[PDB]
Write a structure and sequence with these properties.
monomer, 56 residues, alpha+beta, Ubiquitin-like (UB roll), 1 helix, globular, binds magnesium ion, metal binding protein, Metal-mediated complex, B1 Domain of Streptococcal protein G, Immunoglobulin binding protein
Amino acid sequence: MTYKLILNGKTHKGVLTIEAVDAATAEKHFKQHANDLGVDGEWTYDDATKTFTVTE
Ligand SMILES: [Mg+2]
Ligand SMILES: [Mg+2]
């Protein structure tokens, strides 16, 4: 199962995908990868397109 993340951070941008089992596990990892970068932002998840956004 492919989940995508949009990062629109103030210094870091991009699009990352991750192969996961539920969106629970994608969330965990992408949210940890956010912290690691120093991204604190507003999060969204659209289930139909499997896409997390996080915007600083
Ligand atoms: Mg880690
Ligand atoms: Mg670190």
